[PDB]
Design an enzyme around this catalytic site. Structure first.
Site, PDB file in Angstrom:
ATOM      1  N   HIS A 210      40.904 -17.640   9.303  1.00 40.22           N
ATOM      2  CA  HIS A 210      41.832 -17.379   8.196  1.00 40.22           C
ATOM      3  C   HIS A 210      43.283 -17.631   8.390  1.00 40.22           C
ATOM      4  CE1 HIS A 210      38.404 -15.655   5.932  1.00 40.22           C
ATOM      5  NE2 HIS A 210      38.093 -15.112   7.064  1.00 40.22           N
TER       6      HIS A 210
ATOM      7  N   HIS B 164      38.154  -8.791   9.655  1.00 39.77           N
ATOM      8  CA  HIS B 164      37.425  -9.416   8.554  1.00 39.77           C
ATOM      9  C   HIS B 164      38.346  -9.546   7.325  1.00 39.77           C
ATOM     10  CE1 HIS B 164      33.336  -9.582  10.080  1.00 39.77           C
ATOM     11  NE2 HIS B 164      33.362  -8.294  10.300  1.00 39.77           N
TER      12      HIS B 164
END
Length: 104
Positions: free
Chosen positions: A10, A97
């Site tokens: 990410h 996450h």
């Protein structure tokens, strides 16, 4: 699953993610979508400071986001750039996450 993996999945160095290139690699394996955060890693890590047991947190600040969204052609994407808050799972002081954009 951990900070190093979250980073790999990410965080981006460039706002203009080459979706058609990166998404086809093994890490992403042509999934429908992936949100990349255009930022230095520290501002990202800081979101989770002091949080020990697993907990979802919505960022207080806004970040530059670059999403790779699949088109009608499999494994071919559209890059959409935006600015928004995001939700992450924090564990032992670091994001592990990516939850979602705009809300937990």
């Amino acid at each position: 699953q951990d900070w190093l993996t979250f980073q790999k999945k990410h965080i981006t160095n460039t706002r203009d993610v080459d979706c058609d290139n990166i998404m086809s690699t093994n890490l992403f394996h042509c999934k429908d979508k992936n949100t990349f955060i255009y930022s230095r890693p520290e501002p990202v890590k800081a979101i989770c400071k002091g949080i020990i047991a697993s907990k979802n947190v919505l960022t207080t600040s806004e970040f530059y986001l670059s999403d790779c969204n699949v088109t009608s052609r499999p494994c071919k994407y559209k890059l959409k750039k935006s600015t928004n808050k995001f939700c992450v799972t924090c564990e032992n002081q670091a994001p592990v996450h990516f939850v979602g954009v705009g809300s937990c």
